[PDB]
Design a protein around this nucleic acid. Structure first.
Ligand code: ZN
Lengths: 189, 94, 172, 68, 52, 191
RNA sequence: UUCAUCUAGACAGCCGGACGGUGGCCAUGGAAGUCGGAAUCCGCUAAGGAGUGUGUAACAACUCACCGGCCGAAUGAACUA
């Protein structure tokens, strides 16, 4: 073994006493927010993911924890694992219904949706003054403030963003990585 | 309270700063124990000592942006005496 | 240096009249005939024990043939030699008929590929491996499938005379 | 609308094939090539036309279109 | 002044490709040996120096 | 190490049609027929059933059995290329000077050229094979879109249009002006 | 040869991560994750360093060692002659 040095006492004591399961299925996930929203309310529930033998976990743990192992195999997809529970989802959609915070895909890699400009009150100043100061948007320093009056047509879908152009969208701290933490698999009591 | 390289997590509100210090760790022995953390800072190093220092383990991550999740008692053996070398007072020194 | 033979040679190290009846060593030797076989005995045994040929004799020379020279059997052979930078062991595997016929086509690539020769090779034990498909050099495991079909292309024909009239075809 | 390739038709050497010796002692009598031993040599035994069961090579026999 | 992504479109074909430290040819930026015979497919490859 | 026998899986779709004598290939697909020549590799092919093709170099060496995977990918490209073909994105660049690549037709031979490249006075010229037919990306500016049913004769007729533009006796990592090729594609939709 | 994997699913690839403190001490005009001296991180995990290479003078922006998902079985290193 190079990869499974400690896997027998990995989760064959974790789900040993747990019968009502909430699941997680994702690739659109962070780390910084992610494993520290693994630090959300822990103390009675544990968080983990499986790996390659989740294709075999249909026939690894066949020791009949609960006799409904048809509900176990065909979701070996994504960063998929186990966030256990006792009681149902009656208040679990009162916490993580719309949670997100991130940096975008790498240095200005792909991002699905579209933004739009609007005359609002921001009031910025020339900081690192080599980003966007002559590209057509008005950085007209209005005796202290900045109020945009233009309607630009740049933002598209499926982008591979260049040098300084990935800190114009990131000037507004925009992250397309939503993932309100879902529960997709039906398994209880 | 401190003169070290001050991290700022400061969302300002009507000129009033966020009056808790995110506290670059310049006041971890010089508070009520020996002066050599901030006092005597340009005479020699501050990696000196393994002496009986503290058992105030609760307050330790109450200052520096509490992010343990599971156990804060694993981090209380782990900055003062590990990230520094002035006071640890236990032989988990590895 | 022929098609090889295999022998047992029974050495004894001449009876001392302080303590007679010595200990009767026995080997297994590959040899082109019976009288290179005797001189391979006093060259392997002089690495083990305190003898020489003027200090011993040969009790008997019993030529062996195989009990089944008519089946096939995958072999695994340990040899050691010295190419000119140093002495080296190691191993080969031959898919061949009998124990004597394998060591030819064991020596007939170790002389061709690593360019050693017969005064340097020291065969350790010609092991007939136990069954099929539990062997480790995979280039004999070309030959371990069911329905082993292959055609050989390009059937060249011999020339009895020196003027064909035909522009020869090579259908097989 | 036709996806044809020509023949791919040779003779083949199969386990238990018939074959025709051409040189040596046997000299033009029908063997039966039973079992491959290597790429350049095989086993033959057709022992109703007076041949023993020895390992022969393939630079010495030619092949017939019969197969059983 | 060109587009910085079109600068990066140009960058794959000319700018960042490795070079043999013995026969000076352009080598593709991950490559163990070289590709030719007067260097003997050698195993020293400096990267291509930038404009700082 | 003298491999015994080797076959693989060349797929044939429903419309294209492959009939081969000795080892040359005839192919007719939905977008204009072709034929090519491969008489240097010593293989044999077998259609099994209407959609799949074998290759075989049995009693091959080791440099033989590298050249079967290469003709898993020398006859597929014409199978795709007779029902897709190749489509090209070749973005321009200007550092100080424009570029007007436009298809003049001298001698009725349809030769593509380029003026005004880095302030030059030579009129460049490129010989243009058949198969291809130059079009430009209209109103999404300064690219070239090269069609065709061939595979080598499109990206040698593209690769020898992005290497005329070499600037010489200067730096090449500042003088980034030239002609480069952005992304080749297939002319069919979603590609 | 000598090791480690190897249908508990491997490698090459591709989807997404890669940190909260801490901008750990010293040395610093300026050391932050990637100029440096000395040691030699917790939490959880799938796992992330008191950092494998870039980048601001110093912040930050990236690739990464390090990983969970699609294919899905054979793969990698150091030596030898
Ligand atoms: Zn070279």
């Amino acid at each position: 073994r190079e990869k499974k040095a400690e896997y027998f006492a990995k989760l064959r004591e974790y789900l040993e006493e747990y019968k009502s399961l909430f699941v997680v299925g994702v690739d659109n996930v962070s780390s910084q927010q992610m494993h520290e929203v693994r630090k959300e309310l822990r103390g009675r529930a544990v968080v983990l993911m499986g790996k390659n033998t989740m294709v075999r976990r249909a026939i690894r743990g066949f020791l009949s924890d609960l006799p409904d192992f048809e509900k176990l195999l065909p979701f070996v997809k994504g960063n998929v694992g186990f966030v256990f529970t006792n009681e149902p989802l009656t208040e679990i959609k009162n916490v993580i219904v719309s949670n997100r915070v991130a940096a975008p895909a790498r240095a200005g890699a792909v991002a699905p949706e579209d933004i739009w400009v609007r005359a609002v009150n921001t009031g910025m100043e020339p900081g690192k003054t080599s980003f966007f100061q002559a590209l057509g948007v008005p950085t007209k320093i209005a005796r202290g403030t900045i109020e945009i009056v233009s309607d630009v047509k740049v933002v598209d879908a499926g982008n591979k963003v260049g040098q300084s152009e990935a800190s114009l969208l990131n000037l507004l701290n925009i992250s397309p990585f939503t993932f309100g933490l879902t529960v997709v698999q039906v398994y209880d009591n | 309270k401190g003169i070290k390289v001050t991290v700022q997590l400061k969302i300002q509100n009507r000129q009033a700063a966020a009056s808790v210090v995110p506290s670059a760790s310049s006041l971890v022995i010089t508070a009520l124990k020996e002066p050599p953390r901030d006092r005597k800072k340009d005479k020699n190093v501050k990696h000196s000592g393994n002496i009986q220092l503290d058992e105030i383990i609760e307050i330790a991550r109450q200052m520096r942006d509490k992010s343990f999740g599971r156990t804060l008692a694993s981090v209380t053996k782990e900055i003062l005496g590990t990230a520094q070398s002035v006071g640890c007072r236990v032989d988990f020194k590895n | 240096m022929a098609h090889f033979k295999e022998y047992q040679v029974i050495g004894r190290r001449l009876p001392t009249e302080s303590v007679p009846e010595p200990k009767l060593f026995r080997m297994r030797i590959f040899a082109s005939n019976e009288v290179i076989a005797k001189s391979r005995y006093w060259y392997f045994l002089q690495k083990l024990h305190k003898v020489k040929k003027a200090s011993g004799e040969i009790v008997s020379i019993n030529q062996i043939n195989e009990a089944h020279p008519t089946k096939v059997k995958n072999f695994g052979v340990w040899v050691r030699y010295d190419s000119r930078s140093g002495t080296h062991n190691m191993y080969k595997e031959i898919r061949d008929v009998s124990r004597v016929a394998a060591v030819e086509t064991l020596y007939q690539d170790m002389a061709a590929r690593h360019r050693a020769r017969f005064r340097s090779i020291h065969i350790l034990k010609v092991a007939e491996i136990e069954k099929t498909a539990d062997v480790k050099r995979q280039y004999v495991k070309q030959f371990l499938t069911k329905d082993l079909k292959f055609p050989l292309p390009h059937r060249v024909q011999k020339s009895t005379k020196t003027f064909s009239y035909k522009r020869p075809s090579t259908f097989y | 609308t036709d996806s044809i390739v020509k023949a791919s038709n040779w003779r083949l050497v199969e386990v238990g094939r018939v074959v025709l010796i051409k040189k040596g002692q046997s000299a033009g009598k029908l063997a039966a090539i039973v079992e491959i031993i290597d790429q350049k040599k095989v086993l033959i035994d057709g022992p109703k036309a007076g041949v023993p069961r020895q390992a022969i090579n393939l630079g010495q026999v030619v092949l017939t279109p019969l197969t059983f | 002044i060109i587009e910085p992504s079109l600068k990066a479109l140009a960058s794959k074909y000319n700018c960042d490709k490795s070079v043999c430290r013995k026969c000076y040819a352009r080598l593709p930026p991950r490559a163990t040996n070289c590709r030719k015979r007067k260097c003997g497919h050698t195993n020293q490859l400096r990267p291509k120096k930038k404009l700082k | 190490m003298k491999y015994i026998q080797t076959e693989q899986q060349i797929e044939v779709p429903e419309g294209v049609t492959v009939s081969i004598k000795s080892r040359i290939v005839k192919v007719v697909g939905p977008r204009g027929t072709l034929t090519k020549n491969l008489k240097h590799i010593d293989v044999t092919f077998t259609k099994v059933n209407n959609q799949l093709i074998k290759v075989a170099v049995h009693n091959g060496g080791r440099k033989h059995v590298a050249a079967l995977r290469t003709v898993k990918s020398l006859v597929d490209n014409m199978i795709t290329g007779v029902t897709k073909g190749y489509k090209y994105k070749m973005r321009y660049v200007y550092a100080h000077f424009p570029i007007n690549v436009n298809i003049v037709e001298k001698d009725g031979a349809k030769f593509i050229e380029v003026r005004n490249f880095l302030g030059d006075k030579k009129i460049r010229n490129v010989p243009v094979r058949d198969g291809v037919t130059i079009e430009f990306s209209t109103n999404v500016k300064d690219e070239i879109v090269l069609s065709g049913n061939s595979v080598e004769d499109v990206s040698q007729n593209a690769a020898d249009l992005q290497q005329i533009c070499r600037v010489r006796n200067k730096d090449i990592r500042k003088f980034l002006d030239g002609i480069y090729v952005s992304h080749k594609g297939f002319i069919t939709e979603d590609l």
